[PDB]
Homo-oligomer: A and B are copies of this chain.
């Protein structure tokens, strides 16, 4: 006799993300050596961490300009990988292919001013729960925030904390979403001395515990 076997209904169909392998047909090919080829990367986040990219402001510039007027709120944006300001970053470029995330996102501010341009800035994370972000450093001061001044060192880095009810969050934003689900980031200018027209470049990168899960192919094709 031979081995009895039940061919089960429901199984066997092809699934585009299945964990199997096809049967081979053209054997014994030895590839040209690619030993030690430069610039390899094995995890997207390794580059997302090492290479920060720029946010988009105003007209479409990668920086913020010091206000000469009495307004101190330099910029404000949604803490969302789908944020308009984050739309040109590599981080968002990757994020679109995942459903959820958690972790620290790092922001980098780099002053472009002249040696005689001086300033003092403040960045704050406004968690959700308030109706509108405060346009005043005084009001924002009550949030997790940091201030720093211009000097020998041009760059200042700040980590946007992951604080939410659920352990993960959506990288995308639903149309019913009125106020950003994860809050805002506000950048203020405490003061400046002869810093009119000078610039503040801001970029973003993944933090040590930034994580993306659940691959997704969402773009229109």
Contacts and interface: CB of A to CB of B under 8 A. Distances in A.
Interface of A: 1-15, 17-20, 22-27, 29-30, 32-33, 166-168, 213-214
Closest 8 CB pairs of A and B: A6-B11, A32-B167, A2-B4, A6-B12, A5-B5, A8-B12, A15-B25, A7-B7
A18 B166 CA distance: 35
A3 B5 CA distance: 5
Contacts of A4: 2-3, 5-6, 8
Interface SS of A by simple majority? loop
Given A7-B12, A10-B14, A24 B19 contact: yes
Nearest to A6: B11
A8 B10 contact: no
Nearest to A214: B29
Contacts of A30: 213
A13 B1 CA distance: 24
A24 B33 CA distance: 35
A9 to B, nearest CB: 5
A211 to B, nearest CB: 10
